[PDB]
Amino acid sequence: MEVIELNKCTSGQSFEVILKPPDPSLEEIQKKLEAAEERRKYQEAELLKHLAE
Amino acid sequence: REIVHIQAGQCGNQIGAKFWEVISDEHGIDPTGSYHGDSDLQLERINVYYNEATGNKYVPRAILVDLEPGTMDSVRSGPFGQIFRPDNFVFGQSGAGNNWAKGHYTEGAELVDSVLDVVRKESESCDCLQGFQLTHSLGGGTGSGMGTLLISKIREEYPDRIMNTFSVMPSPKVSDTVVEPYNATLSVHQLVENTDETYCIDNEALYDICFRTLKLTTPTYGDLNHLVSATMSGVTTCLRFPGQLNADLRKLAVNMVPFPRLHFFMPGFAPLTSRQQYRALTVPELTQQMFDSKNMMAACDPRHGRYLTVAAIFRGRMSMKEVDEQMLNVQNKNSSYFVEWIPNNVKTAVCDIPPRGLKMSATFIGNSTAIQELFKRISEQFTAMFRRKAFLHWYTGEGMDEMEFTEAESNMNDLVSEYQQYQDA
Amino acid sequence: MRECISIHVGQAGVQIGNACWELYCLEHGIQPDGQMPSDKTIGGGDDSFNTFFSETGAGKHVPRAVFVDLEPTVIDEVRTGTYRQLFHPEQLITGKEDAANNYARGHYTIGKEIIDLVLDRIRKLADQCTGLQGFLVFHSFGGGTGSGFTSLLMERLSVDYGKKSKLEFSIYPAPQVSTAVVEPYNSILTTHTTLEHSDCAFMVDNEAIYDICRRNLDIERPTYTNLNRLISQIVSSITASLRFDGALNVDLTEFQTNLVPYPRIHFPLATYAPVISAEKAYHEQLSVAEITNACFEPANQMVKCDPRHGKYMACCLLYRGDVVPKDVNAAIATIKTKRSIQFVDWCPTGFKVGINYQPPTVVPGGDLAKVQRAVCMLSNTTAIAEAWARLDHKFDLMYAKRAFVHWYVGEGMEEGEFSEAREDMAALEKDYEEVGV
Amino acid sequence: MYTFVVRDENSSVYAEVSRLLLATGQWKRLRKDNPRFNLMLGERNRLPFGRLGHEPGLVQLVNYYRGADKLCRKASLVKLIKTSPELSESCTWFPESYVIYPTDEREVFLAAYNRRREGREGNVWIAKSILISSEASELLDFIDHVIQKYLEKPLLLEPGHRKFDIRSWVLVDHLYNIYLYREGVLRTSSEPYNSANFQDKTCHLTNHCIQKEYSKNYGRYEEGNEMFFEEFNQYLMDALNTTLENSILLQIKHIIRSCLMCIEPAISTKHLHYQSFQLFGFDFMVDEELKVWLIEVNGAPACAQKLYAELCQGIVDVAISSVFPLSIFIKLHH
Ligand SMILES: Nc1nc2c(ncn2[C@@H]2O[C@H](COP(=O)(O)OP(=O)(O)OP(=O)(O)O)[C@@H](O)[C@H]2O)c(=O)[nH]1
Ligand SMILES: Nc1ncnc2c1ncn2[C@@H]1O[C@H](COP(=O)(O)OP(=O)(O)CP(=O)(O)O)[C@@H](O)[C@H]1O
Ligand SMILES: Nc1nc2c(ncn2[C@@H]2O[C@H](COP(=O)(O)OP(=O)(O)O)[C@@H](O)[C@H]2O)c(=O)[nH]1
Ligand SMILES: [Ca+2]
Ligand SMILES: [Ca+2]
Ligand SMILES: [Ca+2]
Ligand SMILES: [Mg+2]
Ligand SMILES: [Mg+2]
Ligand SMILES: [Mg+2]
């Protein structure tokens, strides 16, 4: 039961008790966002082609 | 999030008219378009189905379509006939003769562009259109043949919008002509491809409910449309009133449709009481009847298949706590009838505003694999005639070939087998 | 003084945000118009509450917050709410149609079209900061916006604010209030994409909050309002050290230092006590030992799980009210000799304690009774992996049949992203295994 | 209508339990992967405790205590008795044991073995996780586990001069009440105990498998080498002039309480979101001084053929019906 690092202020206090010792770049993100948009556009064009038949 | 409503053919316009009569009463709208309600819950989502024109009047966002003026004349002279926008009456004169080819390929093709002009005008005024709902039968010619032609062209012009239908399925017990299985089979394939949600309303089930349960000795079409009107009000409650679950057409589809083609729902309603009507129901009674086959509108036995998804909507002032435990009671008591590979597939919603004439009601929306019994029934009736090419000349006379019938037959058999795949998995 | 910006995404994020900022104003004595009588420096400040509030020349204290939702119905409630004067229009961002409980719709389809607007509005608040230290992001796991758009924002925040810390307050899905069957899909998808971009994340299971509201508050059918006022108490006790004078968890960096030794294991468990129904006219005021003991009762945890069958990597005790260190030490000593508190070997068995003398503030007319002392325990225990197991199991059931997958592929997402996300969660569960067993 | 699932098909005890539940008309068995159950008869290994207690409107009960493995494994039991102050390393009813890894206590086991050789005391030890030897070298070489003192002077049942161990069944319910089954059994050896030749482990190991495979007199003095309590109580009265209750059962009830109370704070489901119960199998040995020793605890025991019906019905009444309503037990108060 060792109490360490006791800091006291008017608002309260804090301390520690011890009981025992022991990213994608902007380009890579834009690439993935536009790839998904192209797959959406491709699926929509195939539907319009199917409806044109 | 506006919905554009379309009603096509005799059945679609007669059922569509009753639907607008019922929900206009619930939202406090009179036949002149004026509001006379006592709660703001009636107006909070009124714009989903109504346009507000000048003078603080509400005009339904509804388009009335037919190849014959007869039924739509009756609508214009009906109770709420004056509430409909006069320009939204689009009709021809020749009729469709209960012929899918006439609705889809010849007579209907001549009229469809004028309907799409009205659809376009109603859509241009929507702040953010979310989709369309169509009411029609599958056994006739205009609603079935021209309705599915309409759905195809609407999808082409609005590919990113939700398409929802209330589709009345024919039955030899309530039949007008012998070609209804032909018309139903041709249009079911259209619905498989071009709608996101379809409420399967079987006229046999409506007849049996009117006769066996409601004790109506001689059911009329008006009696059948009473049930449909009450069912349509229930299944659209979550769209018309404030709520958290299935509040729009796309979230409903996401919750109800685990596979794109399997979007054919069994609707149900409770209470269904013969005329007693004054007896108050309890939440356990509402929940038991709502899941009972005798309250289903598709004439399929749910115990012959499994539930993929279920939407439940309780209306009225009731114990929300007791609602939750009764819903859990149903699932935990008969858990073999729900697929285990979709956890928590039963979603419940509660609305405080009850339907007219009732203090409490429950509406059932189920995506059950037992709906394959409906498509199998139509398929047997189709094959019994098509095997002898009987009555085909009505269709080949309009330019169709036998091959298109063979393909429609194979498509609906494929759909039946697709339901069989997920009933055992 | 270093500022913090709060971001609220989706319905859950926005509604919880409105409950927290209401509570912050009550705690700091900020009137609904934005005035703060106890603030003698008008038009500017350099003290602790200025980390969450900017100041106008007219003395208005403005939250450093941005609200974003793809549907305007929830944010419009903020525009007309009690604290409408606090926010200016640039802080509130709405779309026309939502993500429809679809991660791919929120991340790819709608996220791509609105991500630049959100970042621009965040840049405006960031440009008002003298030394911005990072972001607190409130969102749900199950919603299409809360899951899909949040992961896109966290990516762009790591890009545009590489040195800043990012903390999450995340709502784990519970079928008792859940609005979608695909919420397990969205939860795992957004955890896979956000994991590398979040330094510390506090998960809140709606199931746990639901039952605490039923048992401790005697609410038969808890609403989002009941849940959010309770969640706001927890979040307030977690952020209190950033908004008040003190020495524990004084900046966002110390949250990772004190609670997250291993970067991927950054989901501390929160436990709060006491929760007393305001409908009770009188209640026996619990002692320091009694509220500290309740921190090890699973019925008080934000995620129902069993810390006895895991291992602790860190443990913080955050007290509010009439508490002195002597009673805390005596409470901890007696608890060690009655409970299973096993730490990993490469960490010291101990507790970091923070005490704020001001008792917790309750919303007047709320469900929570004012108490003389309260505590929130933040413990990084491997037992929280039980929540990942439940979630991954539900994912496996639906995905084995590809149920609902077409909704995601239809928005441009590849089906392989499902498998990448599930494999990442599988590695995550293994990490908790080799640390806690 | 309560619901339950079965996830351990090779369990003879709970196969009868589930059969009894179905025979009440108020229980329905679901598919093993259906989560909407009231009762789980779970698998032995890797029971998913973390998925229990998360089903709205379902009180969920499981037939295993998470964490009870600390008591039902040889190595963990020795660690538990040494480390826990409630049991302590000076525990008198448990044989001197040491955990040997092939932390490791190989230097302490030799320190005690050398201490025994210094005093010319009985230096026979047994290893298991089996080799009985009088030299520490032969034991450590065989491992490359736990080595404990072999009871060189056990109580020998006459006629036969033979060895025996006592199996006690214990049921702990969701309230952590400890119920001791009134009907125990004695797995007797049918071969005379022989202090010479400890490798002939037919008279030295009372396992029903070994006695049914190598013992010549298997089924002579008692069927299946299983003597019930009534006959054994009569023997102690005729031979030793005492009763089973005084000479043995008091020590048995004492050991069961000490073991289960020691782990109660670690495994109790008192305020947990799901409830647990579990059937245990305690194995005891008796020496010639009528002192009882604890051998091991089994987490998934199998009953005796005669008692397979009484105990399983007792499990339904005490552990299952107490949670889901529709004495053969000795309640050990604590
Ligand atoms: N605790 C709490 N949970 C909420 C709240 N609102 C929604 N949720 C939960 O969040 C999940 C749904 O996510 P939402 O935030 O509503 O959805 P969204 O982020 O707006 O995304 P979309 O509506 O699909 O565009 C469900 O599990 C709800 O139970 C809230 O106010 N408080
Ligand atoms: N320390 C000891 N002294 C004397 N005999 C012992 C002993 N340890 C074990 N034995 C004998 O060896 C037998 C088996 O011991 P062990 O503890 O390995 O049981 P086990 O796990 O092999 C089968 P079970 O599941 O029935 O307990 C005991 O029945 C006992 O007769
Ligand atoms: N439920 C119901 N079904 C109808 C109604 N009118 C016609 N039907 C059914 O619809 C089919 C006939 O199609 P119909 O709509 O009359 O022809 P259409 O004008 O060409 O679309 C048959 O199956 C009839 O049983 C009605 O008012 N209510
Ligand atoms: Ca013509
Ligand atoms: Ca100031
Ligand atoms: Ca980073
Ligand atoms: Mg007709
Ligand atoms: Mg939303
Ligand atoms: Mg054993």
Side-chain angles (χ1 to χ4, degrees), chain A, chain B residues 1-278 280-425, chain C, chain D:
Chain A
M1 282 295 302
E2 182 183 358
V3 181
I4 62 177
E5 294 177 345
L6 170 64
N7 313 273
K8 305 173 65 195
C9 66
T10 60
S11 305
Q13 41 186 318
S14 56
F15 61 97
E16 178 173 12
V17 293
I18 302 300
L19 299 166
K20 182 215 171 190
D23 289 323
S25 68
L26 173 55
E27 179 190 19
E28 301 178 5
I29 297 172
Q30 288 291 339
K31 178 183 178 183
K32 293 187 180 182
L33 285 183
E34 294 169 351
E37 187 180 31
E38 280 293 323
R39 287 183 294 270
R40 278 194 311 273
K41 296 187 175 190
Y42 176 80
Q43 296 159 14
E44 180 163 313
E46 295 308 316
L47 170 58
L48 298 184
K49 174 182 177 300
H50 178 83
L51 289 181
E53 291 160 356
Chain B
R1 302 314 306 283
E2 302 84 343
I3 296 175
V4 171
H5 167 93
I6 305 171
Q7 45 190 70
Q10 171 169 39
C11 178
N13 274 278
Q14 287 174 343
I15 279 178
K18 297 303 177 183
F19 165 77
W20 283 106
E21 295 173 10
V22 167
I23 67 164
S24 298
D25 170 70
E26 293 179 4
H27 289 265
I29 308 302
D30 65 354
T32 74
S34 310
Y35 175 76
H36 293 309
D38 60 351
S39 174
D40 284 357
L41 295 179
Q42 298 170 301
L43 292 181
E44 198 160 340
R45 307 181 78 190
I46 192 75
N47 57 273
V48 179
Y49 282 93
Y50 295 79
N51 279 297
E52 184 172 351
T54 49
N56 300 268
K57 283 196 169 181
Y58 294 103
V59 192
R61 199 174 298 100
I63 308 176
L64 296 84
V65 183
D66 210 339
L67 292 164
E68 169 184 355
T71 298
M72 285 171 54
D73 285 350
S74 300
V75 167
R76 197 183 298 105
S77 64
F80 280 68
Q82 314 287 70
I83 209 192
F84 293 113
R85 188 172 187 265
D87 288 4
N88 289 24
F89 288 78
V90 189
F91 57 97
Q93 294 289 337
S94 62
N98 291 289
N99 189 313
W100 193 88
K102 289 186 172 181
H104 203 86
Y105 288 129
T106 60
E107 306 295 341
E110 192 173 358
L111 187 71
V112 65
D113 282 358
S114 56
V115 177
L116 293 167
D117 291 330
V118 180
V119 175
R120 192 172 303 105
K121 183 173 185 177
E122 291 284 355
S123 294
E124 289 170 351
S125 69
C126 291
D127 180 68
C128 187
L129 166 77
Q130 54 169 311
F132 312 83
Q133 63 173 30
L134 170 77
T135 57
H136 65 151
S137 71
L138 301 198
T142 302
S144 192
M146 183 182 189
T148 53
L149 176 69
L150 252 171
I151 295 173
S152 190
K153 293 182 181 297
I154 283 175
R155 185 179 184 183
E156 189 177 4
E157 194 170 340
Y158 309 88
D160 55 337
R161 305 297 86 188
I162 295 293
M163 183 71 253
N164 172 73
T165 71
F166 299 85
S167 298
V168 178
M169 311 297 176
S171 172
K173 318 297 184 176
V174 192
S175 180
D176 293 338
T177 70
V178 295
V179 294
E180 291 167 352
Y182 284 158
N183 300 327
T185 299
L186 291 163
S187 52
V188 159
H189 177 51
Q190 302 292 311
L191 302 187
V192 164
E193 291 191 347
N194 292 326
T195 77
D196 299 295
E197 302 141 334
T198 287
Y199 298 95
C200 298
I201 303 172
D202 191 321
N203 258 359
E204 190 179 353
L206 301 177
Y207 183 80
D208 294 343
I209 291 173
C210 283
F211 185 82
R212 303 171 184 171
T213 301
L214 275 58
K215 303 306 176 186
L216 303 175
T217 296
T218 314
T220 64
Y221 275 131
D223 297 336
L224 302 192
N225 300 339
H226 160 69
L227 292 177
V228 182
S229 215
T231 297
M232 294 184 57
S233 170
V235 307
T236 63
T237 288
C238 293
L239 310 169
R240 297 185 282 113
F241 297 103
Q244 292 282 324
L245 174 75
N246 303 322
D248 61 30
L249 292 173
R250 190 173 301 280
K251 282 188 173 179
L252 176 67
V254 169
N255 281 342
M256 294 295 289
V257 188
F259 310 97
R261 285 163 288 184
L262 308 187
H263 56 265
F264 297 94
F265 304 153
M266 290 178 43
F269 187 80
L272 294 175
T273 304
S274 59
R275 192 175 301 254
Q276 296 187 10
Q277 54 180 332
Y278 319 104
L281 281 84
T282 74
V283 174
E285 297 174 20
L286 269 188
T287 315
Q288 188 282 310
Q289 300 171 3
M290 176 182 56
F291 278 95
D292 192 0
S293 309
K294 309 169 189 175
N295 298 67
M296 307 283 176
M297 311 279 166
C300 303
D301 189 10
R303 292 175 173 175
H304 296 166
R306 305 188 73 191
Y307 285 122
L308 305 169
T309 56
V310 173
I313 303 93
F314 293 79
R315 297 190 64 178
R317 303 176 73 257
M318 67 194 69
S319 170
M320 187 166 300
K321 170 180 176 181
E322 198 174 15
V323 169
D324 294 327
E325 62 178 28
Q326 290 301 324
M327 284 311 295
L328 299 171
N329 178 22
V330 164
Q331 308 174 63
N332 298 325
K333 240 62 177 181
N334 326 275
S335 55
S336 58
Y337 295 110
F338 303 86
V339 295
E340 300 188 5
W341 36 277
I342 300 184
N344 312 109
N345 57 9
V346 180
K347 295 304 177 191
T348 309
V350 176
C351 179
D352 295 332
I353 296 188
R356 183 181 183 179
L358 291 316
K359 290 181 180 178
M360 295 198 315
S361 71
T363 302
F364 174 85
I365 306 172
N367 189 349
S368 164
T369 65
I371 199 64
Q372 72 171 292
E373 294 183 336
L374 192 153
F375 301 116
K376 194 179 308 169
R377 185 192 63 170
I378 299 302
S379 191
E380 299 176 1
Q381 304 163 9
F382 177 96
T383 295
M385 296 186 297
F386 184 68
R387 182 186 44 191
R388 308 291 293 267
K389 304 183 180 181
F391 307 99
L392 269 191
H393 70 93
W394 297 125
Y395 300 85
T396 62
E398 304 299 313
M400 287 184 74
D401 183 71
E402 297 180 1
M403 184 63 65
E404 186 166 344
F405 282 76
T406 305
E407 297 174 353
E409 172 182 27
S410 305
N411 295 330
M412 195 160 63
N413 287 336
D414 284 349
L415 178 67
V416 168
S417 65
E418 185 168 358
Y419 281 109
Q420 194 60 42
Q421 168 186 356
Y422 292 109
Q423 188 166 330
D424 312 319
Chain C
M1 191 281 305
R2 301 190 67 193
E3 304 90 346
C4 295
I5 296 177
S6 293
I7 309 176
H8 313 278
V9 185
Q11 170 174 308
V14 167
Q15 293 184 165
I16 292 171
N18 216 19
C20 298
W21 287 105
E22 176 191 22
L23 190 52
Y24 293 166
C25 295
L26 297 175
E27 291 179 7
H28 294 285
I30 295 174
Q31 300 169 355
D33 41 67
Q35 295 287 323
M36 183 178 176
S38 66
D39 188 358
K40 304 310 173 188
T41 49
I42 305 296
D46 198 13
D47 39 56
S48 293
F49 60 82
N50 283 116
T51 66
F52 279 60
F53 292 88
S54 60
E55 303 190 27
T56 72
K60 176 191 289 185
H61 295 58
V62 179
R64 308 182 191 270
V66 52
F67 298 76
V68 51
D69 198 4
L70 307 182
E71 154 214 10
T73 68
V74 186
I75 284 192
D76 281 316
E77 297 176 356
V78 191
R79 299 190 171 101
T80 65
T82 305
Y83 294 89
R84 59 185 180 276
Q85 297 180 92
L86 251 57
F87 312 94
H88 50 272
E90 290 80 3
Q91 303 176 263
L92 315 173
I93 309 174
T94 63
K96 279 300 172 58
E97 48 186 351
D98 61 40
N101 295 320
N102 188 334
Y103 172 92
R105 195 167 171 87
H107 184 82
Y108 295 99
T109 306
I110 307 184
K112 181 179 182 297
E113 80 186 16
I114 205 187
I115 181 62
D116 296 319
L117 171 61
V118 170
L119 295 172
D120 179 274
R121 301 298 173 79
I122 292 171
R123 176 63 62 189
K124 292 302 186 297
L125 298 183
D127 290 348
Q128 205 179 356
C129 301
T130 304
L132 175 69
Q133 59 179 297
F135 307 92
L136 293 75
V137 186
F138 300 75
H139 64 106
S140 63
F141 276 173
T145 305
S147 67
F149 179 75
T150 299
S151 64
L152 177 57
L153 181 65
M154 297 287 287
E155 288 179 352
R156 292 298 304 268
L157 286 182
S158 300
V159 171
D160 298 10
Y161 303 87
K163 311 298 183 174
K164 318 288 186 178
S165 294
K166 288 182 273 303
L167 274 62
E168 295 184 81
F169 292 94
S170 304
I171 298 308
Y172 181 103
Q176 266 165 333
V177 287
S178 80
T179 60
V181 183
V182 293
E183 300 204 26
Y185 280 169
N186 299 335
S187 304
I188 277 149
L189 284 171
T190 197
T191 299
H192 165 61
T193 305
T194 310
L195 205 52
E196 285 188 359
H197 305 272
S198 184
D199 302 308
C200 185
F202 302 102
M203 277 193 301
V204 177
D205 192 348
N206 265 344
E207 177 193 57
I209 302 293
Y210 196 76
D211 284 331
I212 296 177
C213 287
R214 294 164 76 189
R215 307 185 311 256
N216 302 11
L217 298 178
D218 295 323
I219 307 176
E220 292 183 349
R221 181 62 176 90
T223 63
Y224 285 145
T225 308
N226 308 125
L227 305 185
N228 290 350
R229 280 183 175 172
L230 178 60
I231 296 170
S232 63
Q233 293 292 335
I234 326 295
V235 174
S236 173
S237 69
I238 296 176
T239 66
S241 60
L242 301 166
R243 301 178 283 111
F244 295 94
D245 189 6
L248 177 64
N249 296 343
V250 72
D251 54 59
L252 294 179
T253 297
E254 297 188 1
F255 275 91
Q256 185 273 329
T257 291
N258 294 334
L259 294 171
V260 185
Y262 276 165
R264 275 170 67 90
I265 311 300
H266 60 63
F267 299 87
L269 180 64
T271 314
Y272 189 88
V275 178
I276 302 297
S277 172
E279 299 297 334
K280 297 187 181 182
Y282 172 85
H283 62 269
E284 298 174 5
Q285 295 291 358
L286 297 185
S287 65
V288 172
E290 292 178 314
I291 67 175
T292 310
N293 190 34
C295 287
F296 299 86
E297 207 71 19
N300 300 314
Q301 296 163 183
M302 297 310 111
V303 180
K304 290 198 298 178
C305 63
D306 199 340
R308 299 175 299 176
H309 294 100
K311 291 183 186 183
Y312 294 89
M313 286 156 283
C315 193
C316 284
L317 287 170
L318 301 173
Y319 292 93
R320 300 179 81 163
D322 177 54
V323 179
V324 292
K326 173 189 59 177
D327 298 324
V328 175
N329 299 332
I332 290 179
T334 55
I335 287 171
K336 273 298 295 180
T337 65
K338 275 197 173 185
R339 295 183 168 279
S340 313
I341 310 173
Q342 169 85 346
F343 276 71
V344 296
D345 296 327
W346 52 281
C347 290
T349 302
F351 305 85
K352 286 190 171 67
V353 180
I355 299 175
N356 191 285
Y357 291 149
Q358 177 177 312
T361 297
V362 298
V363 173
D367 305 309
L368 274 68
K370 169 164 287 297
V371 300
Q372 293 169 341
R373 59 195 60 83
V375 60
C376 177
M377 189 170 90
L378 304 177
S379 61
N380 195 340
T381 160
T382 67
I384 206 171
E386 300 174 32
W388 301 128
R390 304 157 49 204
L391 214 50
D392 287 327
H393 182 251
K394 293 186 181 180
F395 183 105
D396 288 350
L397 285 177
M398 290 192 297
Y399 191 64
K401 310 290 190 300
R402 298 307 185 271
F404 307 96
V405 169
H406 67 281
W407 288 113
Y408 296 76
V409 176
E411 299 288 352
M413 193 175 95
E414 314 194 77
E415 195 181 82
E417 184 162 355
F418 274 100
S419 69
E420 303 181 40
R422 181 60 184 89
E423 291 177 25
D424 194 8
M425 301 301 303
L428 188 63
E429 295 198 58
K430 275 198 59 181
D431 293 327
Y432 282 97
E433 273 283 347
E434 60 179 7
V435 174
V437 181
Chain D
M1 193 73 167
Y2 308 111
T3 54
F4 69 99
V5 298
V6 176
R7 299 169 68 95
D8 185 4
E9 299 282 0
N10 300 325
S11 170
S12 32
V13 173
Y14 294 98
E16 167 84 332
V17 169
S18 66
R19 189 195 63 80
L20 292 174
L21 298 173
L22 300 160
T24 61
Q26 318 191 24
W27 283 85
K28 177 179 182 301
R29 175 176 181 180
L30 315 173
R31 294 174 286 257
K32 64 179 182 60
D33 300 322
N34 192 337
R36 318 187 73 93
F37 59 85
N38 289 109
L39 177 63
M40 169 177 289
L41 308 178
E43 58 275 45
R44 312 188 199 96
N45 304 119
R46 307 204 62 85
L47 200 159
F49 295 98
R51 310 213 303 264
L52 303 172
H54 300 278
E55 278 300 335
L58 279 183
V59 180
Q60 291 195 316
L61 179 69
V62 62
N63 67 328
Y64 278 97
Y65 264 102
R66 188 185 190 184
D69 52 304
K70 252 74 171 179
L71 199 67
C72 307
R73 283 194 174 187
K74 275 86 160 182
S76 60
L77 171 62
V78 180
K79 176 194 171 188
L80 182 74
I81 298 183
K82 293 182 176 181
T83 310
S84 302
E86 301 83 47
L87 310 180
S88 77
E89 58 206 12
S90 297
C91 176
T92 62
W93 46 261
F94 187 72
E96 190 184 26
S97 315
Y98 299 99
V99 183
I100 305 304
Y101 285 84
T103 182
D104 180 78
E105 316 183 62
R106 191 182 301 260
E107 316 180 34
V108 200
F109 162 67
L110 295 177
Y113 177 91
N114 295 10
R115 226 299 316 274
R116 290 191 146 274
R117 190 71 69 183
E118 173 260 343
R120 298 192 176 278
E121 311 163 15
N123 223 341
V124 178
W125 302 70
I126 178 180
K128 51 186 175 181
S129 62
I130 294 184
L131 173 69
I132 310 175
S133 175
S134 62
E135 283 191 345
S137 303
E138 317 172 20
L139 299 173
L140 299 176
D141 298 4
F142 148 78
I143 299 181
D144 304 87
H145 291 262
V146 55
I147 301 180
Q148 69 172 180
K149 185 189 311 178
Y150 186 78
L151 300 186
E152 303 181 6
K153 303 202 293 187
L155 183 67
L156 298 186
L157 303 184
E158 309 297 346
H161 206 64
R162 52 209 183 98
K163 198 179 178 177
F164 74 99
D165 77 313
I166 301 181
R167 159 63 65 83
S168 298
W169 291 279
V170 181
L171 179 68
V172 180
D173 63 12
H174 62 295
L175 305 182
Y176 220 87
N177 293 316
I178 304 169
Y179 299 102
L180 170 63
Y181 190 18
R182 169 190 56 204
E183 297 290 332
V185 299
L186 281 74
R187 297 181 293 255
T188 64
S189 171
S190 40
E191 301 302 319
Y193 182 88
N194 187 19
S195 179
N197 182 20
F198 276 131
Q199 298 297 337
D200 190 358
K201 306 188 192 309
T202 311
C203 75
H204 295 295
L205 307 185
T206 65
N207 304 76
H208 187 276
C209 309
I210 292 183
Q211 301 295 333
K212 207 175 183 181
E213 188 181 357
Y214 311 109
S215 190
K216 52 174 184 180
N217 295 13
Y218 173 80
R220 191 178 191 264
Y221 321 91
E222 51 274 336
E223 60 171 20
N225 287 20
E226 296 185 346
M227 181 187 299
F228 285 114
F229 272 179
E230 184 176 1
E231 178 182 345
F232 182 48
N233 173 66
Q234 186 65 51
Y235 168 77
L236 293 174
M237 295 191 294
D238 306 329
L240 286 317
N241 191 28
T242 191
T243 65
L244 179 56
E245 168 65 39
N246 296 22
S247 63
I248 292 178
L249 208 53
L250 289 179
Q251 303 172 78
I252 285 187
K253 291 181 298 182
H254 173 64
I255 294 176
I256 297 167
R257 289 235 305 276
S258 303
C259 291
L260 292 174
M261 286 182 57
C262 176
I263 63 172
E264 181 169 358
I267 72 173
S268 173
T269 65
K270 193 174 187 295
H271 301 291
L272 200 59
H273 42 285
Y274 71 87
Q275 297 298 304
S276 289
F277 70 94
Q278 188 169 352
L279 176 67
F280 292 98
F282 283 80
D283 296 352
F284 300 100
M285 267 286 303
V286 191
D287 63 1
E288 66 183 29
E289 302 286 338
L290 288 177
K291 175 182 179 180
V292 181
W293 303 81
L294 177 64
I295 295 309
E296 83 159 18
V297 186
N298 294 83
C303 193
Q305 173 55 33
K306 170 190 173 184
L307 311 172
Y308 252 114
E310 184 179 357
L311 177 56
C312 286
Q313 175 62 211
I315 289 181
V316 173
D317 297 358
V318 171
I320 299 174
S321 296
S322 59
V323 181
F324 312 106
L326 299 179
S327 180
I328 70 175
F329 293 104
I330 312 176
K331 175 167 180 172
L332 308 182
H333 306 295
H334 57 77

